């Protein structure tokens, strides 16, 4: 699976930072590309996951639903708006692959990954 | 895939005196040195029956078929290939397909949608190939399916000696079709008519198809 | 801030079999299963080990994994200088209903 | 991996001996209880088209699998006609299906414009509007996705967990048939007066080896009395020959 | 008709509860009793009905389980299991003698009842 | 959460006639006949009008119930010291194929 | 009667079939797979009532 992302981008508190995550030889109505963030020079800090079908989106307790995803079974891509902005929000963004059996939970392979700095 | 050839020749039909050929076995039973009165059908001795040749030939006439029918064709090159008993080939009619081009003898029945006229004659001009296996576009609801080992068959097509004979009588009783075969490769002669003498029609196979059948097209290549 | 606690930073000769050790709780790793991620410096991290004793990516025989309780150890044998990398051990609670991954542990490989 | 509920998939079963020794034989197999036919049965009678509909539903969503039941699934993702024949097994695959994560394959529909007829097949899964302005474009306001995704986690309690169900429907009898059960095995016994029922040639006698030969189309052999005297055994094509005792 | 129901019963939430209520002076396998749930001051709810032969049983419709029968006709006994047990299941169970008809279905008479707190 | 409406609480003198009314759905009050049930509080319950027009074991005659469309009405003439007791509605319903019951009415004695 | 009778029963598995005017009456548990079994009713082997 290859988990193209989109480019490093900066951004200002509250301006909010959108993430393309694309899928390649896979079709994408019946996988999920769960996403995490991890601090630069520090630990990977679980964000959630978006099913493309019907939109159901489990997100992180921290985040209480300020973030959203979108995901579309005909775009193949899974689009995260973060909302909210601040210091420790600057991290790199790695998508993964969710394993097999329906390919919905846990992280398999994770994607190059964008840094955002706040 | 099919083309729209058109450009058909053809020619008046023939008759033949049928004198002897079409006597099969009448049923399951062995019994030895006994003669038996049966009443069943059969292909009556010296008998009318329509000959066809084809060369610059396109001929694959519709014929109407009635309860049981006798084919016996010489040939060499085993141009002919099969049939279809379908009564509408509009993929709305559960249609037959009876091909058996190299080693697979492909029996279905279900909603057929074929060509204008299925041919698997034309492929790559002069040299032989098979083609058209696309002689319907779709098939839906499809019941019955079977595949079975092939008949003694000819490579490609070869023109001259026509030493094979193959002659089968077709019927379908109590929504059973049986098929009664035989294969003699022994014609030591010019075609012309029909030989003489006896040849004993052992069944071939029995298939609860079921469907009624009231015309029907031969496949050749 | 990790709900798994690992070292800072690891370092070993190479060839020499190097412990990485991950605390977390009860219903984080004593209840379902630990899982250690290895990710290259600058690269997308990888599954190192899952579901405590086997590897997802076929990876080689010497990263083996174990957990005990709440505690989970990822022992590498025959290190090599290409093995200095980032190790994250990441586990499933019901608590907050999710995967959590813990602080990250600096392997470093010396001379 | 099995189909799922709002897409059941129908599977032909024809020109075949079924043996339900397999199927009477695994362990996790609980639900199984026969309407039409007897469960105990089904390895000794002829059928002629028989229909298979394999799919994993909730504990809680058993009940409603019954034919003429109503409810939830029963009525919106897949019914059963009330003069069903035949029955359906239903058994867990909670290790297997559900992962250790919990897998959300399953989707059911929620919203419906009314309500299914039994057998019926329905693949569109179009946004339901909740109000009388009709809505289109996305979801949101007035209108709602019809479909939920099953949650099965290990730490589900029980009634909770995937469990497959196979759906057998056939009918009795009303065609020429093409699944039969598989019939009674006997060894051959030889010059002993015998009750043989040689392929329902039901007789009595005494049979040797018979020097006498069959063509391999032919099965029985007749006299000038007109009754048989030597039949082909299934398992030995050898021939035999049938005389009284 | 006397029917006689266990003792009060104290249980932690999560955990099995195990009640009985005996036939005296008539024939069990001739009289069936459909457990009843009732909380205090509160209105009455079926739980199942069952027969002491074969021992078929019905149970709540908004239960699937939950609730386990079971009968001994040689001891004339009916046993209840609650499993799952939850704060809101502090109640009474009243058992049920079924009217007439020999005995198998509506209500005529109730057990002393079975308090539970859970 | 019963599916039968009754009211929670309810009041009356010695000798006057009041009427407690229940209410439920067409499938198992429009289709089958309602029950009655009364209970002295800290005693098991018992049958006070069955069928809407007869009582188990001869009942005072005083008690009376009647059932129209939906809905049901329990009416007593003669209200007396220990008639303080939990009154509840029972009907078999197809939808739920089981007894649905009331929430259950206090008919209390005033001074 | 509106709660549903049940107190008529008819036999559902048997050894074999019965002669006419049969009047022997069992509770006993129908053996129908091949490994046997004792007791109550369990897998493959189910009440036949
Ligand atoms: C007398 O008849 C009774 C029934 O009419 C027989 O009892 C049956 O015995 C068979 C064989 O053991 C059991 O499978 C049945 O379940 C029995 N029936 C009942 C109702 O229990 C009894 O065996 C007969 N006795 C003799 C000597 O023939
Ligand atoms: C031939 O043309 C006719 C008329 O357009 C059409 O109905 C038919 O399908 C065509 N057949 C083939 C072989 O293309
Ligand atoms: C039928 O056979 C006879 C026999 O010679 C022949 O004269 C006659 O022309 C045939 N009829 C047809 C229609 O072929
Ligand atoms: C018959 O089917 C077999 C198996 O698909 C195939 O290998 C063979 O080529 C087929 N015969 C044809 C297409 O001539
Ligand atoms: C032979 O048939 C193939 C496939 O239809 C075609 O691509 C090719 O051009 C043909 N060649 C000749 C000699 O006509």
């Known amino acids: 699976v290859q988990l193209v992302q989109s480019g490093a981008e900066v951004k200002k508190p509250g301006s909010s930072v959108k993430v393309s995550c694309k899928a390649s030889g896979d079709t994408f109505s019946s996988y999920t590309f769960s996403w995490v963030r991890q601090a630069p020079g520090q630990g990977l800090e679980w964000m959630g996951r978006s099913i493309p079908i019907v939109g159901k989106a489990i997100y992180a307790q921290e985040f209480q639903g300020r973030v959203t995803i979108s995901a579309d079974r005909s775009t193949t891509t899974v689009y995260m708006e973060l909302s909210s902005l601040r210091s420790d929000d600057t991290a790199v963004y790695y998508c993964a692959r969710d394993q097999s059996g329906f390919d919905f939970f846990y992280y398999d392979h994770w994607g190059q990954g964008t840094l955002v700095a706040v | 895939q099919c083309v729209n050839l058109t450009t058909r020749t053809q020619l008046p039909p023939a008759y033949t005196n049928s004198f002897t050929r079409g006597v099969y076995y009448p049923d399951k039973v062995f019994r030895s040195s006994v003669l038996h009165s049966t009443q069943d059908l059969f292909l009556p001795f010296f008998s009318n029956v329509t000959w066809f040749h084809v060369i610059k030939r396109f001929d694959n006439p519709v014929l109407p078929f009635n309860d049981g029918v006798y084919f016996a064709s010489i040939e060499k090159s085993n141009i002919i290939r099969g049939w279809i008993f379908g009564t509408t080939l509009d993929s709305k009619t559960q249609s037959l397909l009876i091909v058996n081009n190299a080693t697979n003898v492909v029996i279905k029945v279900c909603e057929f949608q074929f060509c204008n006229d299925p041919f698997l004659d034309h492929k790559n001009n002069k040299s032989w190939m098979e083609s058209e296996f696309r002689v319907y576009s779709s098939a839906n609801n499809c019941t019955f399916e079977y595949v079975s080992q092939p008949f003694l068959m000819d490579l490609e097509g070869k023109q001259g000696n026509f030493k094979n004979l193959r002659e089968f009588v077709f019927k379908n009783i109590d929504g059973y079709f049986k098929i009664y075969s035989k294969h003699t490769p022994i014609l030591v002669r010019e075609p012309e008519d029909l030989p003489q003498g006896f040849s004993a029609l052992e069944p071939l196979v029995d298939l609860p198809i079921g469907i009624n059948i009231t015309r029907f097209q031969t496949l050749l290549a | ?111 | 991996r099995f189909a799922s509920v709002y897409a059941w998939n129908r599977k032909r079963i024809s020109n075949c001996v079924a043996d339900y020794s397999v199927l009477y034989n695994l362990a996790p197999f609980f639900t199984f209880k026969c309407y039409g036919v007897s469960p105990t049965k089904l390895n000794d009678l002829c059928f002629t088209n028989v229909y298979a509909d394999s799919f994993v539903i909730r504990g809680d969503e058993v009940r409603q699998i019954a034919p003429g039941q109503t409810g939830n699934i029963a009525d919106y993702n897949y019914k059963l006609p009330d003069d069903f024949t035949g029955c359906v097994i239903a058994w867990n695959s909670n290790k297997l299906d559900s992962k250790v994560s919990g897998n959300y394959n399953y989707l059911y529909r929620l919203f419906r414009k009314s309500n299914l007829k039994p057998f019926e097949r329905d693949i569109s899964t179009e946004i339901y509007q909740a109000g009388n302005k009709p809505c289109n474009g996305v979801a949101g306001f007035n209108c709602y996705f019809p479909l939920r995704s099953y949650s099965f986690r290990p730490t589900y309690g029980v009634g909770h967990q995937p469990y497959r169900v196979v759906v057998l429907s056939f009918e009795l009898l009303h065609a020429p048939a093409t699944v039969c059960g598989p019939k009674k095995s006997t060894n051959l016994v030889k010059n002993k007066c015998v009750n043989f029922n040689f392929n329902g040639l039901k007789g009595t006698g005494v049979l040797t080896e018979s020097n006498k030969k069959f063509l391999p189309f032919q099965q029985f052999g007749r006299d000038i009395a007109d009754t048989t005297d030597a039949v082909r055994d299934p398992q030995t094509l050898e021939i035999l020959d049938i005389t009284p005792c």
């Open chain 3, 1 to 111: 801030q990790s709900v798994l606690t690992q070292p800072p930073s690891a370092s070993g000769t190479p060839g020499q079999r190097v412990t990485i050790s991950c605390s977390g709780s009860g219903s984080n790793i004593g209840s379902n299963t630990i899982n250690w991620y290895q990710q290259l410096p600058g690269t997308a991290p990888k599954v190192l080990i899952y579901r405590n004793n086997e590897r997802p990516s076929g990876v080689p025989d010497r990263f083996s994994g174990s957990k005990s309780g709440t505690s989970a150890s990822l022992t590498i044998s025959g290190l090599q200088s290409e093995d200095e990398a980032y190790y994250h051990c990441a586990a499933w609670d019901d608590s907050l209903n999710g995967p959590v991954f813990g602080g990250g542990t600096k392997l470093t490989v010396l001379g």
